Design a protein around this ligand. Structure first.
Ligand SMILES: Nc1ncnc2c1ncn2[C@@H]1O[C@H](COP(=O)(O)OP(=O)(O)O)[C@@H](O)[C@H]1O
Ligand SMILES: [Mg+2]
Length: 382
């Protein structure tokens, strides 16, 4: 008895959970009211473990005791060159244990803990499970979980193992771009079609060329950039306001961490607002040395600050086409995935790359992966 199976997007930066109820997919909001949840862990001084928004939102001078981006490490060996490169950029300690890159943090009272990447991912799945259980009013035991198309055997198995730790029987692992296609019902079509999935997220960018024939998907080619997404657009805005503040006041903002943390949170909020309005205000009381911060950002300035990065996303699309032996006119469906595809300019540039062809529309792009997982979960719940 699998009960109500949940569909989970276990994301590098943001995760999402959905279920099939009363004849449709329902994307479930967490206890902070959000339909996506940061893949983030932290600790209080008392040694309480925070997960999700509360973890990411906790003001700290000790980023070395937060954990995030565990998906970059999951199912890999310590000596994997990808791991050895990624640990340069992660503020928390990673140590070799049982051949793997375990995460070592202080959690309160001088207590040290060491966690496998799949134990961190298990904490995130637990939070997703709790989110679904609160919505459903009952326990959940089974899940469909998505992974990037490029995940190998160890990465898939380690994702299943994270489920096991979280008390979730991972019944099916499905590829993220495929899950998005399923969300749009592209599996339920006749003839053979070429689908280009453009997935621009928080820290990661994935482009995938899928074919669909008689209900069966094949991932023909993949590309992208493992360190390009909305976090980078935020940093460009940060640099803009840090330089302006120095020019204005003479002071170097970066000397104070919690200040940088406050500006980052407000910059991210502003960026999101600018996907649906043309100006946003950034305001922070007691920003730096007792002085308040108050500035505006226009959509045009946001675009100007990131135009080169926005344009760089086309190169991996051109590469998957060449690797697929396809031209632009061979693409039958374009699917936008990832939170950063909410950016109007990103939509515009993809459409222009495809000579005016409209993408699929109607599912929030940061939810589309979980949506498709939930579709499959619906069938499995019966
Ligand atoms: N309305 C929006 N406008 C611009 N960016 C957004 C919007 N909503 C979410 N984002 C960005 O999407 C990114 C997260 O993408 P998502 O696909 O949810 O994460 P992941 O890459 O971890 O799967 C973040 O940088 C977030 O700031
Ligand atoms: Mg994603």
């Amino acid at each position: 008895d699998v009960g109500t199976v949940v569909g989970i997007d276990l994301g590098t930066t943001y995760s999402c959970v959905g279920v099939f109820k009363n004849g449709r997919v329902e994307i479930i909001a967490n206890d902070q009211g959000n339909r996506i949840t940061p893949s983030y862990v932290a600790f209080t001084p008392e040694g309480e473990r925070l997960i999700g928004d509360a973890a990411k939102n906790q003001l700290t001078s000790n980023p070395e005791n937060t954990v995030f981006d565990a998906k970059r490490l999951i199912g890999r060996t310590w000596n994997d060159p990808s791991v050895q490169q990624d640990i340069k950029f992660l503020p928390f300690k990673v140590v070799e244990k049982k051949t793997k890159p375990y995460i070592q943090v202080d959690i309160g009272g001088g207590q040290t803990k060491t966690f496998a990447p799949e134990e961190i991912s298990a904490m995130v799945l637990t939070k997703m499970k709790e989110t679904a259980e609160a919505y459903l009013g009952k326990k959940v035991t089974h899940a469909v979980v998505t992974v990037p198309a490029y995940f190998n055997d160890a990465q898939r198995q380690a994702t299943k193992d994270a489920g096991t730790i979280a008390g979730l029987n991972v019944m099916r692992i499905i590829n993220e771009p495929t899950a998005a296609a399923i969300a749009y019902g592209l599996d339920k079509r006749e003839g053979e079609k070429n689908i280009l999935v453009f997935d621009l997220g928080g820290g990661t960018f994935d482009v995938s060329l899928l074919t669909i024939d008689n209900g069966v998907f094949e991932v023909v080619a993949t590309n992208g950039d493992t360190h390009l997404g909305g976090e980078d657009f935020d940093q460009r805005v940060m640099e803009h306001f840090i330089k302006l503040y120095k020019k204005k006041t003479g002071k170097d903002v970066r000397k104070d961490n919690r200040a940088v943390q406050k500006l980052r949170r407000e910059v991210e909020k502003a960026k999101r607002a600018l996907s649906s309005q043309h100006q946003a205000r950034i305001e922070i009381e007691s920003f730096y040395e007792g002085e308040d911060f108050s500035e505006t950002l226009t959509r045009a300035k946001f675009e100007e600050l990131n135009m080169d990065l926005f344009r760089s996303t086309m190169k991996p699309v051109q590469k998957v086409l060449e690797d697929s032996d396809l031209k632009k006119s061979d693409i039958d469906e374009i699917v936008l995935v990832g939170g950063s595809t909410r950016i109007p300019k990103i939509q515009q540039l993809v459409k222009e790359f495809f000579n005016g062809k409209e993408p699929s529309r109607g599912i929030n792009p940061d939810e589309a992966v979980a949506y498709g997982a939930a579709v499959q979960a619906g069938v499995l719940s019966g």
